[PDB]
Amino acid sequence: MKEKVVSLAQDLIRRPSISPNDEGCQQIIAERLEKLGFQIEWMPFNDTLNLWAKHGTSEPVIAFAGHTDVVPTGDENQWSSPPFSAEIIDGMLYGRGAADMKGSLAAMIVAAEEYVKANPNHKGTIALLITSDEEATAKDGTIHVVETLMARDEKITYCMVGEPSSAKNLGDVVKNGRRGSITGNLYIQGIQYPHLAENPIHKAALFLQELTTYQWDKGNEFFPPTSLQIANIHAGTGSVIPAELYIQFNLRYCTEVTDEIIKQKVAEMLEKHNLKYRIEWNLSGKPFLTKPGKLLDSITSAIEETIGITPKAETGGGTSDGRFIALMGAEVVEFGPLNSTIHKVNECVSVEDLGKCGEIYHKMLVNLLD
Amino acid sequence: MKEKVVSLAQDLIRRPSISPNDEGCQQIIAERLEKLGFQIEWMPFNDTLNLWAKHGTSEPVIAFAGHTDVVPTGDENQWSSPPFSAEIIDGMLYGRGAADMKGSLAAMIVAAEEYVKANPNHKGTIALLITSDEEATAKDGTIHVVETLMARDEKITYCMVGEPSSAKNLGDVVKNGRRGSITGNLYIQGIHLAENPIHKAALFLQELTTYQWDKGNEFFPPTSLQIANIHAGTGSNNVIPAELYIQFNLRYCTEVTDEIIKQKVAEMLEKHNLKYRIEWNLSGKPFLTKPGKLLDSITSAIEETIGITPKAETGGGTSDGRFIALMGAEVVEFGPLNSTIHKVNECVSVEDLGKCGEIYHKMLVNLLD
Numbered sequence: 001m002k003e004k005v006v007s008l009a010q011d012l013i014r015r016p017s018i019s020p021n022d023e024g025c026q027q028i029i030a031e032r033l034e035k036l037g038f039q040i041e042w043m044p045f046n047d048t049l050n051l052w053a054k055h056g057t058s059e060p061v062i063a064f065a066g067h068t069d070v071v072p073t074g075d076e077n078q079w080s081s082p083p084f085s086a087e088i089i090d091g092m093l094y095g096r097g098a099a100d101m102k103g104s105l106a107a108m109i110v111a112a113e114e115y116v117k118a119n120p121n122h123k124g125t126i127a128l129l130i131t132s133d134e135e136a137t138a139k140d141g142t143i144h145v146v147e148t149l150m151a152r153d154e155k156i157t158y159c160m161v162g163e164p165s166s167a168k169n170l171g172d173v174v175k176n177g178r179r180g181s182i183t184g185n186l187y188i189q190g191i192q193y194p195h196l197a198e199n200p201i202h203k204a205a206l207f208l209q210e211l212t213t214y215q216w217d218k219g220n221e222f223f224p225p226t227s228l229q230i231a232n233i234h235a236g237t238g239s240v241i242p243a244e245l246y247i248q249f250n251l252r253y254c255t256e257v258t259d260e261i262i263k264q265k266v267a268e269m270l271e272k273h274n275l276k277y278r279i280e281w282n283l284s285g286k287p288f289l290t291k292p293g294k295l296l297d298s299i300t301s302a303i304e305e306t307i308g309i310t311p312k313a314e315t316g317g318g319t320s321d322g323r324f325i326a327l328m329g330a331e332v333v334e335f336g337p338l339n340s341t342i343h344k345v346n347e348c349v350s351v352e353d354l355g356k357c358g359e360i361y362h363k364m365l366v367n368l369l370d
Numbered sequence: 371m372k373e374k375v376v377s378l379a380q381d382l383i384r385r386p387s388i389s390p391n392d393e394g395c396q397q398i399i400a401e402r403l404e405k406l407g408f409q410i411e412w413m414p415f416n417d418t419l420n421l422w423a424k425h426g427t428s429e430p431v432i433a434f435a436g437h438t439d440v441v442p443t444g445d446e447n448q449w450s451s452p453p454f455s456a457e458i459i460d461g462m463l464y465g466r467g468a469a470d471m472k473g474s475l476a477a478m479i480v481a482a483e484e485y486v487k488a489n490p491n492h493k494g495t496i497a498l499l500i501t502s503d504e505e506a507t508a509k510d511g512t513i514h515v516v517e518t519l520m521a522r523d524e525k526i527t528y529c530m531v532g533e534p535s536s537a538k539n540l541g542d543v544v545k546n547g548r549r550g551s552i553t554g555n556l557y558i559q560g561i562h563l564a565e566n567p568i569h570k571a572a573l574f575l576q577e578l579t580t581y582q583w584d585k586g587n588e589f590f591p592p593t594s595l596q597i598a599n600i601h602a603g604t605g606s607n608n609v610i611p612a613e614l615y616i617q618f619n620l621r622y623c624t625e626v627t628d629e630i631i632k633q634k635v636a637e638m639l640e641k642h643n644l645k646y647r648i649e650w651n652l653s654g655k656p657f658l659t660k661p662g663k664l665l666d667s668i669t670s671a672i673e674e675t676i677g678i679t680p681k682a683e684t685g686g687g688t689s690d691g692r693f694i695a696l697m698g699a700e701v702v703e704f705g706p707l708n709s710t711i712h713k714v715n716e717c718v719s720v721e722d723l724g725k726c727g728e729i730y731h732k733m734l735v736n737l738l739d
C-alpha cells in the first residue's frame with residue numbers, strides 16, 4: 001500500500017494549505033472516500049474547513065484524526081526541492097507538510113480504505129476527522145467538529161491522531177495522554193499603621209505563599225504531580241502609584257484533579273485571606289489519558305508486529321488536537337512518523353516509513369475489530 | 371509694601387505655569403533681584419527651571435523657598451474670573467496660584483528685597499530657592515538644586531518654605547515638621563516547594579508590607595511604605611523577566627533613619643537567602659524644628675504683625691521642605707489660607723498678602739538683627 005499512500009501524500013503536499021486555508025485538500029479526500037461508501041459531512045466554520053467522513057453506523061467508533069494545514073515555508077530559495085512540488089529524491093518525500101502531517105494523513109486514509117474494502121460489513125464505524133486549522137488559531141477546527149458531534153450525542157469510542165510522534169526511530173513513541181492547562185488572571189484591587197495587616201498587597205503575599213506551596217495531588221503512574229507556575233506579577237507602569245496588582249498563574253494538571261477543583265480551591269484561598277479581587281480563567285485543555293487496554297495494545301501490538309519495535313507510551317509531546325477529542329469521552333492515542341524535520345526548511349519523510357505507517361494503521365484496525 | 375507684593379503676585383499669576391513649565395516666572399523674578407545686589411544662578415534640569423539667588427557671603431544662610439508651578443485649572447467655564455487673569459474683586463485676588471503659592475512667593479521676594487535695600491551690609495546670606503516643579507513629578511526641581519549645593523558643600527542654615535500654611539485665619543498655623551522620603555529599588559534574582567525563589571520572595575513581600583517601622587510620635591504620624599512597582603515574568607513587555615523587581619517608597623518620621631530602613635530591609639532579605647541587588651535613593655529627610663532661633667523668629671514675626679500666635683503643626687498639604695532638610699537646614703513653612711488651593715476659584719486676600727510680606731520681613735529682622 002506504500003505507493004497509494006505516497007501518491008495521496010503528494011497530491012496533498014502540492015496544495016499549499018497555509019492555515020486556515022485548505023486549498024482543496026479535504027475535497028479531494030471527500031471525493032475519494034465518497035466513491036468508496038463513506039458518508040461525507042462537512043463542518044466549515046468561519047474561515048476553517050473541517051470534514052467528518054464515516055463508514056459504518058455503530059459502535060465501536062474508531063476515528064483517524066488529523067489536519068491538512070501546514071505552517072509557512074520561509075524563503076523558498078532555501079529549499080533543496082521546492083516546498084510544494086512534493087519531489088521524491090532517493091526514497092525521501094520532500095515538502096512542507098510531508099512530515100506534519102500530510103504523509104501520515106495519507107497513510108491513515110489509505111489504511112481506512114483498504115480495511116473497509118476488504119471488510120464491507122465490519123462492525124463499528126471507521127471515520128476520519130480532518131481540520132484545516134490545527135497549526136494556527138485552532139478555534140474553528142477540531143473543537144467545532146467535536147462540539148457539533150457532542151451537541152447531538154454522537155460518539156467516538158477510540159481515536160488515533162496521526163501526528164508525527166516518533167523521536168529517534170519509527171515506532172519508538174506512542175502518546176497516550178497529556179496534562180491539562182488552566183490559567184488564572186487575577187486582579188487585586190485597592191492596593192494603596194494602624195491596621196498594616198489589612199493592606200491588600202500583604203494579603204496578596206499571604207495568598208501567594210499558600211498558592212505556591214499547596215500540593216494539588218501526588219501525580220500518578222502516568223503523570224508527574226500537578227504543577228503551578230507564577231507566570232507574571234505586574235503592578236505599576238515604571239515611574240503614578242498603581243491601583244491594582246495583577247498576578248498570572250498557570251497549572252499544568254493531571255487526571256487526579258479537575259479544573260472545577262482548582263477553581264474552587266483558588267477561590268477558597270482568596271476568601272480565607274479575605275481578599276477583594278477579580279479573576280478571569282482561561283482553560284486551554286483538560287488532561288486526557290489512555291490507560292493500557294484495547295486501544296493502546298492495538299497500536300502497540302501493531303507497531304511490534306509490523307516493524308519489530310516496542311514503542312514507549314508517553315504523555316506530553318506538545319499540542320495536538322487530541323485534548324479536544326478526548327472531551328467527548330473518546331480514548332485518544334497518537335502515532336506517526338519521525339518529527340525531527342517538522343516546521344523546518346527541507347521537511348521530509350521516508351517513503352518507506354509512510355508505507356510502514358499505512359501498514360501499522362491498518363493492523364491497528366484489524367487488532368481493534370477482528 | 372502691600373502694593374509691591376500684590377503687583378508682583380499678579381505678574382506671576384498671569385503666566386500659565388502648569389508644571390513643570392515656568393512660563394518666564396523665574397526670569398521676571400531674577401530681573402528684579404539682579405537690580406539689587408543678588409547673584410543669580412540658574413540650575414535648570416530637563417524640563418524644569420530652578421533658581422538660586424543670594425545676597426551676602428557669610429553664614430547664616432537664610433533661604434526662602436517656593437515654586438512657580440501651579441496645578442491644572444480644570445474647565446475654565448467654572449471660574450467666575452478667568453484662572454490667569456489675576457483680577458482683584460472685593461479684596462480677593464483670584465487665580466490659579468494666588469494661594470498656592472505665587473501670592474506668598476511674591477511676599478517672600480519683596481521682603482527679601484526690602485531688607486537688602488535697607489541693610490546692604492547685613493550679616494549672613496539671604497537666598498531664594500525657586501523651582502518650576504513642586505506640584506507634579508518633582509524629580510528635577512528642588513531635589514536638583516540641593517544635589518548641586520551639597521556637591522560643592524554650600525550650606526543653608528535656615529529655610530522658610532512659603533507654602534500656604536493657614537487653616538482658618540492668616541497666621542494660625544506654621545508647619546514645623548515633615549516626614550522624609552527614601553526609595554528602594556530591589557531586584558530579586560532567580561525567580562521541595564518552599565525553597566523556590568518565588569515562595570521565599572513572597573515571604574519577603576509579606577514582611578515588607580506589614581513591618582511596623584514605628585507608631586509615629588508626639589509630633590508625627592507613623593512611617594508609611596507604599597509599593598510603586600512590582601514586576602516579574604515575561605508579560606507586560608518586561609525586559610528583566612527572570613527578576614522580581616520591587617520599587618517602594620517610605621515617607622518616614624524621626625522615629626527611624628535612612629540607615630535603620632536600609633539595614634532592616636537587608637536583614638529581611640538575608641533571612642530568606644535571596645540573591646538580590648538594591649539601590650536606595652534618599653530624596654528628603656524628616657525635620658522637626660523645635661523652639662529656638664528659627665521657630666521664635668517666625669512665631670514672633672506673626673505675633674508682631676497680626677496679633678495671633680501660630681500653632682506648630684506637622685504635615686498637611688505638600689512642600690519641598692524635606693528635600694531641603696536633606697542638606698541639614700532647619701525648616702519652617704508659613705503662608706496664606708490654604709482652603710482654596712488646587713480648586714476652582716482659587717483666590718487670596720490682598721491684605722493677607724501685605725501682612726505676609728511684613729511677616730517674612732520681620733522674620734528676617736528677628737533672625738539677623
Ligand SMILES: [Zn+2]
Nearest residue numbers: 100135342343
Ligand atoms: Zn505542526
Ligand SMILES: [Zn+2]
Nearest residue numbers: 067100101163
Ligand atoms: Zn501537526
Ligand SMILES: [Zn+2]
Nearest residue numbers: 470471533688
Ligand atoms: Zn505649593
Ligand SMILES: [Zn+2]
Nearest residue numbers: 470505688711
Ligand atoms: Zn500645590
